[PDB]
Design a protein around this ligand. Structure first.
Ligand code: NA
Ligand code: NA
Ligand code: NA
Ligand code: NA
Lengths: 295, 295, 295, 295
């Protein structure tokens, strides 16, 4: 036997950081969950009980906090790049660092119509994420994403013209509910190192904002022929608006809302044009995926 | 042996309803999870295999959908009152109906600064709930609540002057983070029946709004001596603003954010006035409760 | 306004304890999650920012660990009684302690047919719990329970003879699946204090074992007329086997498994006597409850 | 823009199946959650609203049930192979089927020391899984796994000799707790099609059993130098015992149990040799991974 692949580190590292402006009194908070996994010349820790090659996961945890103290934690693409670069530069025998960051929402409260200087609300479990893979000799590969963005439209979704055979029972429809949890990923051009990442820093927040905006507007305005067709429109627009993105990935569940036939009860009409009360289905669910790139 | 208490019914009944304005094109959606449990002269179903006294839970489910089709589902205090009244009036031998409703957020989207007619976002897992107990001969008892409202303030929380003995290690502080998940309940005066509930319908949305507003503003503005002291201020203000409320209950976790001493590393200063990076603690957590009533 | 009720403390306190037998090498582990909430002359902490009456929740946490170090943690009824007694005796102004313990399973592994001295498996998320309410001047009130015991029987469940009216669609059946998650509680006679609890210590593990055994055997052997009827049989037997129990409570979901009619496809027969493939339903679910006491 | 990758289908399809032996009365149950995602000449569903190429996800769901009715559902490697083969053979334009199955435990109950013919218990949330990728022209690729196997050993884990630098605070130890949730995967030699899978059917249950047995015995008996070293031993033994496995993957969290220094309280000794009460840490956690193959 032989080790074919190995990575190790610390997961579920919760981190908070505050910024305090001493002139204005305005405080700003950031909260994330971080995972760092390392690769390198570490196989003898597996095969020969050689712990000398192990940068302890406890030390990886310490390093996350120290790096957050000494550097900005925003945008997460930059923080992850700084963090991963540290491990491959500090340790000769570590050749890759894989950094995953989940950013949690703390939105400033408005109190009597005014932004409060130090109070925040978690307006949803929607996340902003990054996966930053720092590989010695091969730059920095960043995937940015939004996830847990849950939406519903009550009309202007259709599904007809699909294949019909002996396994098919689904009726065609020209007016249905469409609800999903959006998981959208934009994959950046490889960066040569930390200097190139830094050179693009404003584009990370701007591209996240674009991806979110395009998602919401396309979902709301597309009279959808299918989830497939709608998600492709989203991807095409994001690629048109940021040339440093190479691909856009969507993964969308179709969270079904079923009509309820009540005509057995006093002739109640609750289907078709008369449909008002629906049964949300927890499972099963459609799951639709695509990766869109440049033609 | 003998049955001392018994209730049964259908839980986790997911319900969606849409309202469509045919003049304006504007659609409005509601989504809830409903539980209905019945009590009455049902002990022989337990003791003698007498199913004749059982209104089947499947039929209770059907009834929830039928009632949603025939009545408004908002405010949930009214829907729950209609639903519970149905069971005790329809079935001579059923003497109480216990209706729990969890309302899920579907907030209308703004697209290019304009409200969209049929697209919605789940802006958080914060819930609006009701518990409506309809008891024959004893009216309708309603508890309304908000839950899952997650907040954080980065300063203007203190905790000093607590009891100190041989079990105490906690340092006094004059500046800490305070974060919680708000669970707030307002308990209404008993209503004699459905007519009295209907007579107060506008007060249900208005009192929910007040409770939410008071919670947020008091949390943001109170330089908190303790969770105890801050939550009491919230309750007192809600009682002052709605005379048909008899009591207000809060249940608040203290979701700790711990300082991280980094001075072992290059003399880094990250405590006290220099504290910037903190470790959010998943557990344990303080848990603080009170019920406030009229003096 | 005035405080009508108040309790506070530390929740989600995870605790592990090991016992090591230095003669045999055999180690035994216990793991729990503890909550302690206190009541007493504490209202001024809410109304007047008087923290002097607050035994800090951090100190409550410390006390849990200290008490686990100095006392047995098993049976949990005894540990909870020791812990709650400490708070009301130590602090003159604290008059009640409410202790909830969730015990997690660590079952010793058998390796090559032999019990291993120090290795354990979590054989299910089934829990053993206690609620111990220690109230000054009013003894110790204990509720013991098992929860998260998930079972299924594939036949020998029936449901016919229920009420049928214009809200009913459910077909009668003489052979269905029955699956539930058992939540069973046995409520002890009040104990006058810690000495009386200690005097009954062996009965706590023995009654838990009886409750579990009766649950499983009755579920497996009762050709069930209803969940109501089956759960009553369980309760009656537990009360017959431990005179120091005053009541037994069950709360049982009916986790439905629906037949799937496949006759639209090649005349496939999958209902009634031919039913082989079923659709487990995540929601909704029946929910059946009773409390049984002594006649 | 252009579609670079696309797959779609039905997720979270819950399936139950019963086998009834009409001679003996013995019933046997199986429960799974299935996901099927298809790939093929489907890009025009994304780019041109062409639903004619879509085998509806609802039809995929129907097909799962139909296939379970007509074929054995065990071992899951075989069921998944049958299911995936169906889609690529039935639909000329579908060229890959990706089938994920999670198998849920229903272990037969022993009642008064005897196996019951039709009653079962969920003895843990441990799962047995498969990922079966059926690719036209490229056979069938199967990954089998066990997951959610949660274990703890109270001694005979060590961690010393790791790298120590200015980021390190962790003390070396020669006696610690080790607890993990085992996720173990064995990757089979490619199979040319369904006939070859069928030719090996008994090896699927036997290899799962071996993987489980080796995991448990190695965890219990290895005086562990590190998680790395222990997991490698497990993998090497599984590869030695089944030549049709090409690689074994482990992913193991290190679920920390921290000592609690109580010496501030009455000189209580609870560290080192005196350590009895520990604080289980929910987060962060080490995360250790490797893939082991044949040298
Ligand atoms: Na390096
Ligand atoms: Na009645
Ligand atoms: Na006292
Ligand atoms: Na094909």
């Amino acid at each position: 036997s032989a080790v074919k692949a190995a990575r190790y580190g610390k997961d579920n590292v919760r981190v908070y950081k505050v910024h305090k402006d001493e002139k204005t009194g305005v405080q700003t908070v950031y909260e994330m969950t971080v995972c760092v996994l390392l690769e390198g010349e570490i196989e003898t820790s597996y095969t020969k009980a050689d712990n000398s090659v192990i940068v302890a996961t406890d030390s990886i945890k310490n390093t996350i906090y120290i790096t957050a103290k000494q550097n900005p934690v925003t945008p997460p693409e930059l923080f992850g790049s700084i963090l991963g670069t540290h491990f491959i530069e500090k340790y000769n025998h570590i050749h890759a660092a894989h950094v995953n960051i989940v950013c949690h929402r703390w939105t400033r409260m408005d109190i009597d119509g005014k932004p409060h200087p130090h109070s925040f609300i978690r307006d949803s479990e929607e996340k902003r994420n990054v996966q930053v893979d720092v590989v010695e000799g091969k730059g920095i590969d960043i995937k940015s994403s939004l996830s847990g963005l849950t939406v519903l439209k009550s009309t202007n979704s259709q599904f007809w013209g699909f294949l019909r055979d002996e396994y098919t029972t689904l009726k065609e429809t020209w007016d249905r509910i469409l609800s999903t949890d959006v998981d959208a990923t934009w994959q950046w051009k490889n960066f040569s190192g930390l200097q190139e990442v830094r050179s693009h820093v404003p584009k990370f927040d701007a591209t996240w904002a674009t991806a979110r905006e395009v998602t919401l507007k396309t979902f709301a305005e597309d009279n959808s022929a299918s989830v497939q067709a709608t998600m492709y429109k989203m991807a095409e627009q994001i690629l048109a608006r940021q040339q440093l993105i190479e691909t856009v990935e969507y993964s969308l569940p179709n969270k079904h809302y079923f009509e309820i036939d009540l005509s057995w009860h006093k002739g109640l009409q609750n289907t078709g044009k008369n449909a008002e009360v629906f049964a949300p289905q927890s499972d099963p669910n459609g799951l639709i995926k695509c990766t869109v790139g440049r033609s």
